[PDB]
RNA sequence: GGCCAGUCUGGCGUUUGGUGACAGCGCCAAGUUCUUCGGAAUUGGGAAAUCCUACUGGCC
């Protein structure tokens, strides 16, 4: 399955491992870019090869929805994506 | 299995760089070489290679 955009990731590889992140941008079948709204922000998101992240089965509606009229999402609803998906796990 | 590129002594920490193995930085250790004894250089294996073990990324 292709990731999704606003779907929650395990990191499994990289100085950021064991952290949960946030997809906001997919680059094509291998490469997208996670952010997290605190340590690693949407400005400078990070690049990563989809084989070192683990697909949570959780999409944040309010990520995905910001995206498709914004085209942008801000670094608030990144944490708050982040701290809801925590609190129903 | 093939082709290409890359990483290297160990432990703890890390808002930094890297897709990553890793690296950088702080601290504690280890090996090798040199020393004027104050220190200095260096770190997978190999005498060395377009070589090889392990690991990472790409194409098949």
Same mark, same amino acid.
């Given at each position: 399955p292709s990731p999704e955009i606003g779907q929650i990731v @395990?990191?499994?590889?990289? %100085?950021?491992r064991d952290q949960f992140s946030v997809i906001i941008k997919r680059v094509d079948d291998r490469f997208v870019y996670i952010a997290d709204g605190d340590k690693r922000?949407?400005?400078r998101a990070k690049r990563?090869?989809?084989?070192? #992240? @683990? #697909?949570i089965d959780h999409i944040?509606?309010?990520? %995905?929805?910001?995206f498709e009229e914004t085209g942008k999402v801000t670094n608030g609803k990144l944490?708050?994506?982040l701290k809801?998906? #925590?609190?129903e796990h």
């Amino acid at each position: 399955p292709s990731p999704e955009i606003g779907q929650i990731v @395990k990191i499994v590889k990289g %100085r950021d491992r064991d952290q949960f992140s946030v997809i906001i941008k997919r680059v094509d079948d291998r490469f997208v870019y996670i952010a997290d709204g605190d340590k690693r922000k949407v400005d400078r998101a990070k690049r990563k090869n989809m084989n070192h #992240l @683990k #697909l949570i089965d959780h999409i944040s509606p309010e990520v %995905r929805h910001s995206f498709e009229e914004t085209g942008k999402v801000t670094n608030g609803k990144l944490r708050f994506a982040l701290k809801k998906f #925590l609190e129903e796990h």
